[PDB]
Amino acid sequence: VLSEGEWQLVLHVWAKVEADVAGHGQDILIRLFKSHPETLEKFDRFKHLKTEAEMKASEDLKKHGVTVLTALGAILKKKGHHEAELKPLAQSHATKHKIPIKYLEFISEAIIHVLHSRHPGDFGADAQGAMNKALELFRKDIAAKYKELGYQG
Ligand code: HEM
């Protein structure tokens, strides 16, 4: 359970992200795909992209980055009271998209890295630890839904 102070650190940096949702979403998906190429393979929509320059030039990838970060921002702003938001997301990601929980760990790393690069003054160690806790809570709660459905592994 995050404390109120931890949530304030999370949402203070997240308010900075929302000034350029699309640039953050590009940076995060590109980092995810470069660091963990198995993740790119899960996207029929993107797996034609073979270089970082091609990824940066894809408007559709930029659009999807906004979709992803909008869903995550709505979850973070619930401060843990996010059951209604996680139900459909766990269902799609477990049963339709077939995304292992481990790949959610990978995107969480990519998010933390990009936030550190773009917002160092608001993303010191205290805020890094709080965002790590928030993303752990996200993964814990999604993993419980995966397990219900027979996909935790
Ligand atoms: C912070 C974590 C993530 C969030 C908030 C998120 C959110 C979303 C949302 C909102 C959609 C569209 C609605 C839906 O299908 O449920 C979507 C689609 C999708 N997501 Fe995620 N996602 C996350 C992580 C991942 C990861 C790590 C992968 C793959 C490694 C992935 C793969 C996909 C795929 C394949 C689609 C469908 C894309 C398409 O063909 O339109 N997601 N995601």
Distances (CA, A) of 5 to 8, 11, 84, 130, 131: 5, 10, 24, 9, 12
Atom number of ligand 1 nearest to Cα 138: 1
The residue whose CA is least distant from atom 23 of ligand 1 is 68
Distances (CA, A) of 142 to 18, 66, 125, 127, 135: 24, 20, 25, 22, 11
Of 38, 46, 92, 113, the residue with max ligand 1 atoms within 8 A of its CB, to mutate for a pocket test, comes to: 92
CA atoms within 13 A on the CB side of 3: 7
Does the beta carbon of 94 lie inside 6 Å of ligand 1?
Answer: no
Domains annotated on the chain, with CATH = 1-153 (1.10.490.10)
Helices 59-76 and 21-35 cross at an angle (nearest 10°) of 100
30 exposure class (CB count in 10 Å sphere: 0-12, 13-18, 19+) = buried
Q: How far apart are CA 101 and CA 11, in angstroms?
A: 24
How is 2-54 classified by DSSP, letter by letter? --HHHHHHHHHHHHHHGGGHHHHHHHHHHHHHHH-HHHHTT-TTTTT--SHHH
Please tell me whether residue 100 adopts helix, strand or coil conformation: coil
Going from the Cα of 111 to the center of ligand 1, the distance in angstroms, rounded, reads: 14
In the PDB record, what is the listed experimental method?
X-ray
